[model samples]
Target chain A: SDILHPRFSREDISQKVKSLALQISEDYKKLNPIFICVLKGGVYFFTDLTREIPFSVEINFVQARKIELLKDIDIDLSDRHVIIVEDILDTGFTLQYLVRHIFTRNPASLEIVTLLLKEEFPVKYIGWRIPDEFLVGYGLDFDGRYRNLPDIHVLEP
Target chain B: SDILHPRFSREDISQKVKSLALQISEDYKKLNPIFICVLKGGVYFFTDLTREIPFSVEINFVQAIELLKDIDIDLSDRHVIIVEDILDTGFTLQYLVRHIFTRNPASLEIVTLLLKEFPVKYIGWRIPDEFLVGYGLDFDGRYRNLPDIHVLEPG
Candidate 1:
């Protein structure tokens, strides 16, 4: 008997995204900042969140092959306001490492906005705080499946 | 002042992209292809190409450093399309092709938006074979966001 228990419906996620976009727009008014989308997993969230921004913005992507190794950030970030958007926060190692390295580039400001935070990680802005579990959907994948699902669900054991 | 003249205007490039997209759409309509964009140089081309494709396609990006050492995607039995912005020398594309072959893909092909009059397959434009920047091509971390490609003249 296979069943996926739903945690967040499509409507719920959309409402949350709308609220977050409002806050983000208000916070960065007149800044004309850049949004750094952590690639692959972060693609879906990046598209949705960016569409919600009512003002002009620039988008770039970065991929981390390892904790210390990240793909090249092609765009210049000098003295620019940067917001790194992530799909999930777990161990906090990757995000912490990224923030440390980005500071060396002299960005005017840098912040994080994660769609889901695993209970204890301290992120700058969180769409939802979730417990550690085998969950997938809405860009989160279990062996690359379930990513196209419109809602979040806990994979059946 | 030593200044570089523009070779390709924004409209010129757009028309070329539209033509390329039409060909790609017809060729891979049934394959539901996977496009692997070579990063840094290929980002702008990737964005324009995907938007113009009238069919569904999946996209992945691989950087040169990682591809030279290792790649993480599985391509077994999948139709793979590798995209690059420019083909300066065949070295990078050759390395990537060999690396991708190791994964046992069903088929593989290469596409590039600009060719510097070099010998390559499926190039959109046979440019004057000069060092150029703009339209996502960069020089010393500048001119990458320019709407048109310009020849970079040296002083």
Candidate 2:
């Protein structure tokens, strides 16, 4: 079996990502965009997203804090059509705060594209809509786990 | 000033998370409690969540994979409640899927107090919901370039 690794191979991800990129490119044909990938989790997804963004776009990153009392929202989202790429959306706390803070800075526009979403419970939605379910594969994770799976699948427990 | 060795003593995280645990305990006062903690990120949160659960509960650890392949998943649905420290939204989609497939359980739920809503564009999910900034995970400490998993700065 080819199951001798941590996650999916680069080629497998490339092909799957390419298809998703094509769809994204077709949707945003005329808009010049910029990419802002969250570090750590978003690294793999953004790498794939950038390859498929179609038009030439500048990409940047934002450093977020999950630690307590370390509310460091240090990034310039001013006047930019920022595509805040993320791997997954579970609880939505980080996303909710980021949107509020970014809007405060008055960006031209803001949006989110999550690779996975969980609908086990009702999460307050105050931003863009995403598919709701426990997603694996792509670039999302379960417990700092499963982001490497090529196709997202929920753990059966 | 101890700027270099800036570490968040256990007391710091303990105080904040215990409070969250209290609220969670109040919400689920009566139930077959199951705490499923994501392996790495949820370690701290799991410890804290347990303290705050305020009742006798079962705890399990589910390991998730990254954006790669060839990894497996652990699934069990027995009144499972997933606890994670940081919720980075789109990064761990794969791990979540592996988790969602868990069957033979009474319920499945997720809880993460941390998320980043980057003022972004074209999100697959809701806005104001995408808290992908200020999340104090990776980029918050400029550790994006560091490839090691355990190299996170002391908080």
Candidate 3:
């Protein structure tokens, strides 16, 4: 059977996200960590991740557009455990950029998670190691469409 | 089974929210919905409910610290759903509703997980005015992480 299109379907994404959340739950148990949900790209993964987490954790929102750091969230990061959640990562530049601002907050512990790792990015959790290609669906979008697909798809030329 | 605690445990809360989300999904399918998530108190419910919906929707966060809040999503003529964790003391929600209306969304609706006062569009449960914490409701910035909603006997 020849396939015209293939996808990382919703079931695939959900199960993987649950696995990641479970691992994080066991690791961060009783610690009550905080998730700095980076918006736009990270919202979908953030939503799935938090719902699966069994323990109590603060779901803080951050808009990377302005780079205002924790302006939207009030909690003091000083010596507090923090996790930066994102959708995809190909390089450390963006994560480092966000961390530089967070570093001033004196976070006692910090970790990063991405649903799609296009390349090695030194994240604590990675959902899939996908090839570098134009991708849509899930939180990845092209011309502001396909985000609601419930799965990840390669945008082929 | 504990003293001084009216319990709405994790399973109960989760089931009720999933039911609500399914209903909303049926009602708003095909139309891309934007959830104007009221944060701090609403964050937990918002997180659970949105993930339950097996469709496309946008989640926008807004903190209800009076008018000291703003939303980034454009609300002009789009399906807008405000997910509020609780609707007690009507002042905060009423104010927030008006704030959203000023943006002139084509359609506007509100969902209150823990119903308190005023008329609301969707409700997870008809709740009394109880001092509650956990599952998003918090007392002094604590218990927001509680897996279930517990009626707190104010200390």
Best by DockQ: 3
Q: What is the C-alpha lDDT profile of model 1 across B1-155, one tens digit per residue?
A: 43668888878888998898888878888996778877656766765675567544666777762453235567898988888888877788888888888899898888898877623446789877687876667665545545577898865
DockQ of each model vs. true complex: 0.08, 0.02, 0.31
lDDT of 3 by residue, A30-143 (tens): 776888877666767886787678656777766644345333556788888889999887776657787777778899888898888884325788888887777776667665
* Poorest stretch of ten by lDDT in candidate 2 chain B: B118-127
Highest lDDT: give the candidate number: 3
| Full ranking by TM-score | 3, 1, 2
Q: What is candidate 3's CAPRI-style docking category based on DockQ?
A: acceptable
**Interface RMSDs of all predictions?**
6.8, 15.0, 4.1
Please list the C-alpha lDDT of all candidates, in the order they appear: 0.74, 0.49, 0.75
Quote the lDDT for A116 in model 1. 91
Clashing pairs in model 1, backbone N/Cα/C closer than 3 A: none
Q: Can you tell me which runs of candidate 3 are displaced by over 4 Å? A: A1-6, A9-11, A26-32, A47-55, A66-73, A91-93, A134-138, A146-157, B1-15, B26-32, B51-55, B65-69, B152-155
Q: Which wins on DockQ, candidate 2 or candidate 3?
A: 3
In terms of TM-score, the best-performing candidate is 3
Candidate 1, residues A1-157: lDDT per residue as tens digits?
5357989887887788778888998998788788887866776566567646765567777777646354646677889999999988888777777787788899999989989988732467789988878777666777655554557788885
